[PDB]
C-alpha cells in the first residue's frame, strides 16, 4: 500500500528505515516515493541509492560466498541450488531498479547532474547482472552496461567539472567495469589515471560541500591504480 501513503510520509519512513538499518524497507519506501512522479532532490537520490545498494550489496556478498564454495566443491546438488536461489533474488532486485530508472527516472530533461547520476546507476545495475551472467545473455548485459556508462561519460564531460563527485563516481565505476567485467585492464588504468589527474588539476575550483566526497573517490582511483599496476 505504498501508493496510499503521501509522498512526504514515504520519504520520512525511508529516513526512519535508514536509521534502523532496515534497507529492504527503505528501498520499498523510496520506490513508492519515485512512483509519485516528482523528480527526486539530491538528498532523495542519495536515499534511493543507499537503500538499493545495501540490498544488492548483501546479495552480491552472499552470491560470492556461495559461488566460491560451489567452485571448490567442483574442483551434492545443494550448493548449486542455493546459489541459484540467491542469484535469482539478486536479478530480481536489479530488474526492479532498472525498471524504475526506465519507467520514471531517466529523462531527456532535467539538469545534467541528475541525468548522469541515473545513467550511472543504470550502468551499475547492469554491471551487477553481469557479475552473475553466463552465456549469450552476458554479452547483451555487458553491452547495456557499457552503453549506459558511455552516455553518462559523454554528458559529464560536456556539462560538469572534472572534480564533480557524480562525474568522479561514474568514472571510478566505469573503470571498474573495464577491469572486472570487460577484460579491458588497459582501458581501466588509462581511464582511472586520466580521471585522477584531470580531477586533481581542477580541485582548487571544487566547492567545499563536495570536497570530502570527491577526495574519497580520488583515493579509490589511486588505490585501484596501485592494485592494477
Amino acid at each position: 500500500a505504498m501508493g496510499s501513503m503521501e509522498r512526504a510520509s514515504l520519504i520520512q519512513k525511508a529516513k526512519l528505515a535508514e536509521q534502523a538499518e532496515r534497507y529492504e524497507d527503505m528501498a520499498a519506501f523510496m520506490k513508492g516515493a519515485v512512483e509519485k512522479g516528482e523528480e527526486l532532490s539530491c538528498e532523495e537520490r542519495n536515499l534511493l541509492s543507499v537503500a538499493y545498494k545495501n540490498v544488492v550489496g548483501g546479495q552480491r556478498a552472499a552470491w560470492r560466498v556461495l559461488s566460491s564454495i560451489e567452485q571448490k566443491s567442483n574442483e551434492g546438488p545443494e550448493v548449486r541450488e542455493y546459489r541459484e536461489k540467491v542469484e535469482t533474488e539478486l536479478q530480481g532486485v536489479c530488474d526492479t531498479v532498472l525498471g524504475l530508472l526506465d519507467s520514471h527516472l531517466i529523462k531527456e530533461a532535467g539538469d545534467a547532474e541528475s541525468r548522469v547520476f541515473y545513467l550511472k546507476m543504470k550502468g551499475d545495475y547492469y554491471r551487477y547482472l553481469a557479475e552473475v551472467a553466463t552465456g549469450d545473455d552476458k554479452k547483451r548485459i555487458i553491452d547495456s552496461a557499457r552503453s549506459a556508462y558511455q552516455e553518462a561519460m559523454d554528458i559529464s564531460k560536456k556539462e560538469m567539472p572534472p572534480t564533480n563527485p557524480i562525474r568522479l563516481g561514474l568514472a571510478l565505476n566505469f573503470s571498474v567495469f573495464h577491469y572486472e567485467i570487460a577484460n579491458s585492464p588497459e582501458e581501466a588504468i588509462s581511464l582511472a589515471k586520466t580521471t585522477f589527474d584531470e580531477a586533481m588539476a581542477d580541485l582548487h575550483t571544487l566547492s567545499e560541500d563536495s570536497y570530502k566526497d570527491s577526495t574519497l573517490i580520488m583515493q579509490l582511483l589511486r588505490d585501484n591504480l596501485t592494485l592494477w599496476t
Binding site: 542519495n46 541509492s49 543507499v50 545498494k53 545495501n54 551499475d124 563527485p165 563516481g169 571510478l172 565505476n173 573503470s175 571498474v176 577491469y179 572486472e180 566526497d213 574519497l216 573517490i217 579509490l220 588505490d223 585501484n224 592494485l227 592494477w228
Partner: peptide, 9 residues
Amino acid sequence: DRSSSAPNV
C-alpha cells in the same frame, strides 16, 4: 583483491 567501486555516502 577486488577493485573498489563508489561507496555509500
